[PDB]
Design a protein around this ligand. Structure first.
Ligand SMILES: [Zn+2]
Ligand SMILES: [Zn+2]
Lengths: 34, 59
């Protein structure tokens, strides 16, 4: 009965998030902003 | 012997492979998914992330 939030990535979302860490724009791939 | 959810060939120990944890639970070649080496690296290193194949994400 411990519960946790896990973010599911599509391939597109993953490739995008990776490009964003490469270009220094975000910390990690789960660093979602608004 | 695991068929690649996309291309349907075997997924050997010497390849890049990823598991859909969205639902269908199939293994896929990283190449077949279109996922870059960098995305693979980062996603598997990331504690609170999982991957989902494209059919699984559509629904
Ligand atoms: Zn394949
Ligand atoms: Zn799936």
């Amino acid at each position: 009965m411990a519960a946790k939030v896990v973010y599911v990535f599509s391939t597109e979302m993953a490739n995008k998030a990776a490009e964003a860490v490469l270009k220094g724009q975000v910390e990690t791939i789960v660093s979602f902003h608004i | 012997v695991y068929p690649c959810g996309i291309c349907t060939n075997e997924v050997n120990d010497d390849q890049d492979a990823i598991l859909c944890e969205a639902s269908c639970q199939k293994w896929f070649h990283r190449i077949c998914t279109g996922m870059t080496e960098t995305a693979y690296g980062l996603l598997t290193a990331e504690a609170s992330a999982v991957w989902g194949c494209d059919t699984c994400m559509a629904d």
